[PDB]
Write a protein that binds this DNA or RNA. Sequence first.
RNA 1: GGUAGGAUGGCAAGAUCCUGGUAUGCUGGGGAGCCUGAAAAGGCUACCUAGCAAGACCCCUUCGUGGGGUCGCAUUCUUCACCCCCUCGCGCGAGGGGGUUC
DNA 2: CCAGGATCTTGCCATCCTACCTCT
Length: 1105
Amino acid sequence: GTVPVTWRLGVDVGERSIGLAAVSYEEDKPKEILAAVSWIHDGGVGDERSGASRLALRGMARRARRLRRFRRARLRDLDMLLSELGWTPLPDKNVSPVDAWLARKRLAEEYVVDETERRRLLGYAVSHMARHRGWRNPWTTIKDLKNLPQPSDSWERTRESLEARYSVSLEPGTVGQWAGYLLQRAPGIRLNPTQQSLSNATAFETRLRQEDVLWELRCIADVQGLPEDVVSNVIDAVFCQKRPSVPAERIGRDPLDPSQLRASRACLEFQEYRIVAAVANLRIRDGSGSRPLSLEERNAVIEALLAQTERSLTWSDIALEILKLPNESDLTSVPEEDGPSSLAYSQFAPFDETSARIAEFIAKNRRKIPTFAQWWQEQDRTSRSDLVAALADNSIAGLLVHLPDAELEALEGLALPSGRVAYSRLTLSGLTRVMRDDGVDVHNARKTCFGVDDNWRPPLPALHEATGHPVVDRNLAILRKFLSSATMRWGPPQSIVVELARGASESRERQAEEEAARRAHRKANDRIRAELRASGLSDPSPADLVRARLLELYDCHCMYCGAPISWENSELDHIVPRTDGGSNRHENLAITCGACNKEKGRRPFASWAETSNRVQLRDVIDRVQKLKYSGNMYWTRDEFSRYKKSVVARLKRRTSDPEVIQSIESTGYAAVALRDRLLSYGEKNGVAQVAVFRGGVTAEARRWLDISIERLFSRVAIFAQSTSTKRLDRRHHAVDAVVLTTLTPGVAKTLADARSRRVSASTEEPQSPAYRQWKESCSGLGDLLISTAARDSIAVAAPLRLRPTGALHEETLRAFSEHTVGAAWKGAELRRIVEPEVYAAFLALTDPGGRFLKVSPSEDVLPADENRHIVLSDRVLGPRDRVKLFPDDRGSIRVRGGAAYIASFHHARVFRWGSSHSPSFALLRVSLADLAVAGLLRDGVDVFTAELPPWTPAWRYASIALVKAVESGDAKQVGWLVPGDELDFGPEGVTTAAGDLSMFLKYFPERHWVVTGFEDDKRINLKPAFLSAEQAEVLRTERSDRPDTLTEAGEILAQFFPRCWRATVAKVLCHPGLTVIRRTALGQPRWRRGHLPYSWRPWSADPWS
RNA sequence: GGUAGGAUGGCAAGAUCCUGGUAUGCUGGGGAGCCUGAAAAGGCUACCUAGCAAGACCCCUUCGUGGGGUCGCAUUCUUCACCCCCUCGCGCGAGGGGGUUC
DNA sequence: CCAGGATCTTGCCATCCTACCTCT
Ligand SMILES: [Mg+2]
Ligand SMILES: [Mg+2]
Ligand SMILES: [Mg+2]
Ligand SMILES: [Mg+2]
Ligand SMILES: [Mg+2]
Ligand SMILES: [Mg+2]
Ligand SMILES: [Mg+2]
Ligand SMILES: [Mg+2]
Ligand SMILES: [Mg+2]
Ligand SMILES: [Mg+2]
């Protein structure tokens, strides 16, 4: 079975692709391309418009389900409490729309004397407050909510705006009181802002907070004189909220101790470890050399950094006052970036941060927790560390001292430095003890405390272990399929080459502005961090830093309309929204008021500003452009300029264009994680080395091996000047992987130097031995790639999605239409009947000797009969009676008393009937709702051959010829076609071109076509396999940059894409030599029929068993 | 030494999920106001209320077409088949995962 | 949208380790 040869593996990752090569070798030269293939994956994306992954959509749906389930349980507990109290909950129907609001208003205004009426109004109000309670921090308890200032400043500003807007003053002016007053005074007023799409205004502008509803509840209990235990139980039932939790398996494991969880940043062991490691990395000047700090100097600096309350010790202070050095610059190896006026020495040394937080909390709360203050001063650092570990790991889903419950609530309300560190608590304590006692650094402490050697590297994940990142998992699944198939074919690889997504070929001024930008970012982030710790934000997130930056930048106003905003009612609006692919980069983030954010919604900003009467486009662009530079802000001059241009360019767009910036993080993560798992495979399988090379070393290798993708695959120019990029053809990933199999480190250094020389703005051949042996080894690589591409041995393949999982139907429920039994029945109304047995009865009426509905969508099928009684299996309909019908004449299923359209088609079943010399073809397009209502979403079901009933939307909206042929007993299923199946038209190409395809084939003779969809009953959507789609996107964008940068072939490609080939099923499946190609992991077509999807010719496919 | 990789700590910029909430929206049931109406019933603006993938599994029950709980859109060659790994871990065939070469 | 937890990438600063090439 295995034919072992010496071969190398090249791995070239991409965001939507991965190129994998198995290249058999000689002593240093390539011998044969064993397999080269570009695998085109979706990056996990199931939301093509938004870019959100399938895992992200599943997680948001699951969390919405969990929210609804917890809300239902909480409301049931409230209903039990109201039944205990004798308070009547708000009824489901037959009450006024304003009964709850007037209940809240009256209970806030005057004492209700009537006993049953007061209980009814209290039940109405409390049930309505539980349904609409406002937002609170989920990490804060109900006691913290009671500790909040009531009402919030947002509601006080909203109430001031309402008293100004309506010239009245309600007392005490609660949310229910103002809402009832406005719903009675100005009927039809909306309360909260919503998305715009003749117009009106809204009553409230900010997000309702839970302290506002809590304060209204306290005001109602104060007016009505309710007992305190009663209102405390009511507050517990209304504002009950499940605390957020961290699953323990979501926390990584310690590499030195693989059973233990990674320690939190809050741990005092980590704070000591960071201090001792930072001190152990410092050096001291000694006669043009450097020495490590001696053990007494280590102890002095370490005790000065441990015994610290705040950031008071700079590295200059460590050099001068602690080390007693004559000069500041004698302290070398300071772990900061250097700058003017000794910036690195002016940066601050680390300290015990958790001990500072706990000591400051004690100093502010001596009377609140004096027992804890005495106990904290009493305990040693081991029990202190165990306390701190318990306080840090309370957030884990899955306190050693009998403390009072108020002290427990104050301690769990304490804010500690979050984040995980690399090691566990035991490992950190052991390493710290070894570094303190032996006077060694971290590497020697690891060698001592664990017995590891100098070659020790942390354990790496195996190939079967996923990461949880969708793009990385796509690349890894493709890689492990390729590696298993290649290992069983040719044995294990001799070495493995992975391309990392790292680059360094930049000019010195680019490095200078990046260093100055980093300096400015750190300085402004430190100042804003100090302001937020002064303001109570103990641990500012990057979102908090962005929010404080834009509050400072726009003088606490909204960016869009200019309304004054606070910290708590402002919102960080994605200017390009998340549902249009917008990123969390700070140029995409605008500070808003919440009302502007809700009214903009998911729309582009320029279109929203055109439609809206609240903001103006020119005013927002002008307000951005008049921002002026100052002394010390976050951006540099050039960064402030580019920030203004990128913000303005985001504010100016009118369509839902794709996002400008794409995720290079998942490219680097895919390369790094695939390298780690390939290293695990190499440890298991005896691979000699796993080598890594930069992104710009492979391209420089390809351009110095006289290989260009245009010349290799006979591509044409698509630009008027110069030559286009190599990304037109999808096979360039496999060519990149083939080139990667050749590279060695010395050649990598020389091509990196050549690239740095070239981008340092002809052409000098690089001067080195390693380049010369690489060229003499790889002179035949060009001939080998030409011979491989001429036979089309390089494959572009898309992995199939065959599992019947995903959205069963479209999200929006739709109201049922209706049609009288004894009236005229057309074809579209007969195809829309909701009830399957009523449907089958109408088919029995039109055609008793038939099982399907073979009627035209426009023809009048049944006449208007006043004596037509549809006899059901259990009922008789009347001619006056009406039938539920689906609203529109497309595939639909009934969902929860409404109608939902079916989702995208899971597959098409290919049917072939007629003569063998001239067959007829059709597709039974089957969706996930078809299998859902056919009961096929269970165990032991082949979804591509399991029979569907005639009332499913597959058989309802099949073609008339297909329906008549299955009725006649001539059409049997011969295969299936998922979106992503490759069609091979043979070496002769395709003949049925006309109009746009004929012009496409004069520049692009494409024989390989990928199914993307099934638009209607006689059309299959095909795109060329070999040509990219993002390439077509950037060509169509770059057409309008200059007056006709493109050539004629570029215009042909841009006017073929993105609709590509809207084919015709009975035309394209009758091509001679057409084969539906199902490939193996090595890009080779699977032809032997086993238990995996095989290749099949539609013209000569035998019928299904 | 220089280049490249890896560790740890720091700084900066981002990505990916996960947990809990808010508000909207959709559909069913309602209705406060307004309009067109009325021997002749529907819309509009809000608001209230239930549900918000189809469904699966467990427990009820002082027996019901329902109450309660846990889940259900990922891992993209479904199912079947053969091999492998971790867990039902006695060379057990039941849960998850992985591979099947043209 | 909100708070906040977890995983990870890239780039710089410091330290340690590894392999590898290039000169003298
Ligand atoms: Mg590449
Ligand atoms: Mg809720
Ligand atoms: Mg609520
Ligand atoms: Mg509203
Ligand atoms: Mg927004
Ligand atoms: Mg690539
Ligand atoms: Mg409403
Ligand atoms: Mg609602
Ligand atoms: Mg449900
Ligand atoms: Mg498989």
